[PDB]
Amino acid sequence: QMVSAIVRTMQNTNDVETARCTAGTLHNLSHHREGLLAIFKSGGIPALVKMLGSPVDSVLFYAITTLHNLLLHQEGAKMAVRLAGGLQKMVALLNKTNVKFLAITTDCLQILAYGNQESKLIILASGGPQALVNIMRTYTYEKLLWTTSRVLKVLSVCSSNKPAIVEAGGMQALGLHLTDPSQRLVQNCLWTLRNLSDAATKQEGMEGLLGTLVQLLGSDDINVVTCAAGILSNLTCNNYKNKMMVCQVGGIEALVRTVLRAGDREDITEPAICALRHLTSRHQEAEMAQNAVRLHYGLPVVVKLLHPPSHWPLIKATVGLIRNLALCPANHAPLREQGAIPRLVQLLVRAHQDTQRGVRMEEIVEGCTGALHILARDVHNRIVIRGLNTIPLFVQLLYSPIENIQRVAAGVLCELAQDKEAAEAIEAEGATAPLTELLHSRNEGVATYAAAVLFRM
Ligand SMILES: [Cl-]
């Protein structure tokens, strides 16, 4: 009756002092497993949530705290808060300016959003993303940045909240804190950054973030290194401006050092190698990046990654990187001396067999043949490639249902056919027929390569 009276009292008065004292009591009662029941039983949650609209900060503070306590301990308070319209009221409170108050509020949101897609969608509809991002760009209070970064991390895996957080300028905002002395704050920002950076729209003002990510690759903390490598990989995929910036701040050396120190830890090498693959292609300084991998002692370890214990994702990425490295003439000989060709060929042969009987082996087929196509620009490499009895296989790939495989197969044959002895071997393999057909390929690259092979023979 008392608690019930207290709730009603609070939930009715218009005189602010009746609010302070009532809220205070409920608060004080929530310190014990009992009060978390008196309030809950007496329908306090809907009343408290109602007080989240109070004009008296003193009130708001008391209500959000009691709610926080119930949310933390009281079984069944999270669904009750949701039902009462708690989420909308809390997001609306994110425009307040008291950091202790904001820390309690954002923490309630984290507790409610975690493992609950429904709440994540409501936070989004209520404007949660922009409001959380503004907090990261405004305050310095660690407890608040941390709690807010946790709400962002929870929303960052939602296909709907993700693009909204990115649009609100979230990645740049999170980037501001990557050198904060608070490790828990840095790591949460990196985890959120990794989820958001995957397939995000192109952003402006990413310079600082990119420079800091490269520096973090040298960290002794594995989780920091793994995240920095993953973010760099995501942000450089088909983004020539980011590739340029990353290369300009020493990204190639840093990444190579990272792969070297990673050893067989694929959680680090796989993304670092994908980043290197992005940085060694299609941007103004790609050639320079191709040379830089060599110059910083990267060729031997890149080839080594093609061998066990490497798993498929890593091998796929590594093959892709070698393909780009081979575009640089000065890497032709060293890649050959380091043994890239026979391993690429063994991978190709085995991968093809599987297709004739996660990463799809068709991707490895295309990948290796593609790398061989580029390596074949060098005469000594053509001798090695040919000496490994690859021609019969390349010709067989002409019959592939996949156009891209048809393309690199015709392309590597095209390079090989520039040497008369090879042209005869290719013809002896009965490549004329399949090549002829491919002349009418809707895929212009295929058609164009088929024609060049036919000419050379
Ligand atoms: Cl080998």
Side-chain angles (χ1 to χ4, degrees), residues 307 339-344 346:
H307 298 264
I341 299 175
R343 182 54 185 154
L344 286 170
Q346 295 298 343

Side-chain angles (χ1 to χ4, degrees), residues 4-7 9-61 63-214 216-285:
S4 184
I6 299 178
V7 176
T9 306
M10 181 180 64
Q11 174 174 45
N12 288 302
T13 308
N14 272 302
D15 188 359
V16 302
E17 176 82 68
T18 320
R20 176 185 299 185
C21 189
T22 307
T25 306
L26 306 183
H27 181 184
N28 301 309
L29 299 180
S30 61
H31 293 66
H32 313 65
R33 186 180 302 297
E34 56 177 295
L36 292 175
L37 284 172
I39 305 172
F40 182 104
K41 292 300 185 177
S42 175
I45 294 175
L48 295 164
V49 174
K50 180 179 179 182
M51 304 302 70
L52 294 178
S54 178
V56 185
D57 300 311
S58 176
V59 178
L60 290 175
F61 183 77
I64 198 66
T65 301
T66 306
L67 285 170
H68 192 215
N69 290 153
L70 295 160
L71 291 176
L72 288 176
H73 317 298
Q74 179 57 62
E75 163 181 45
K78 298 191 304 183
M79 177 188 66
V81 177
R82 304 189 173 82
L83 276 300
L87 297 167
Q88 296 81 176
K89 294 289 177 58
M90 295 170 176
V91 178
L93 287 167
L94 300 176
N95 68 164
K96 293 302 188 176
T97 59
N98 179 285
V99 307
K100 283 184 165 54
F101 171 74
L102 290 174
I104 304 303
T105 301
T106 52
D107 196 49
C108 290
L109 295 174
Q110 195 278 157
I111 296 174
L112 289 153
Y114 182 65
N116 193 284
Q117 184 57 37
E118 193 172 3
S119 305
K120 298 185 179 191
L121 290 181
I122 294 170
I123 292 174
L124 172 57
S126 302
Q130 191 64 67
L132 297 163
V133 171
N134 295 330
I135 285 174
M136 300 301 301
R137 297 190 295 211
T138 307
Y139 304 92
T140 64
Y141 188 63
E142 194 278 344
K143 172 72 168 184
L144 171 58
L145 295 166
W146 176 60
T147 301
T148 299
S149 71
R150 296 180 69 195
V151 179
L152 289 171
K153 184 188 174 300
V154 168
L155 303 175
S156 67
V157 298
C158 167
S159 58
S160 293
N161 275 280
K162 183 193 300 179
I165 299 169
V166 169
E167 172 179 57
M171 293 192 300
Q172 299 88 328
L174 289 164
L176 298 175
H177 307 283
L178 293 183
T179 58
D180 188 280
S182 175
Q183 291 311 307
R184 66 179 185 176
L185 169 54
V186 170
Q187 190 52 243
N188 281 284
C189 289
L190 285 170
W191 286 322
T192 309
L193 280 171
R194 182 174 58 185
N195 299 329
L196 301 169
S197 65
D198 172 39
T201 59
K202 293 187 174 184
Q203 293 294 305
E204 291 303 319
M206 296 290 284
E207 301 64 42
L209 172 48
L210 292 171
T212 303
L213 291 170
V214 171
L216 293 180
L217 288 172
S219 174
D220 285 336
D221 189 327
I222 295 303
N223 288 301
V224 167
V225 173
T226 301
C227 284
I231 300 163
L232 285 174
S233 172
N234 291 337
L235 295 178
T236 57
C237 183
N238 298 305
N239 189 311
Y240 79 79
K241 286 195 170 65
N242 291 341
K243 296 183 184 181
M244 281 286 287
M245 180 57 58
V246 176
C247 288
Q248 304 200 315
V249 297
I252 296 288
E253 184 184 6
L255 285 172
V256 173
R257 178 188 53 60
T258 298
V259 173
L260 286 171
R261 301 178 58 192
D264 61 7
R265 287 167 277 172
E266 295 179 58
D267 298 307
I268 300 173
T269 59
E270 192 287 323
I273 290 298
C274 291
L276 286 173
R277 181 187 62 199
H278 300 163
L279 303 172
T280 52
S281 62
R282 303 182 290 91
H283 74 94
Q284 194 179 297
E285 299 306 309

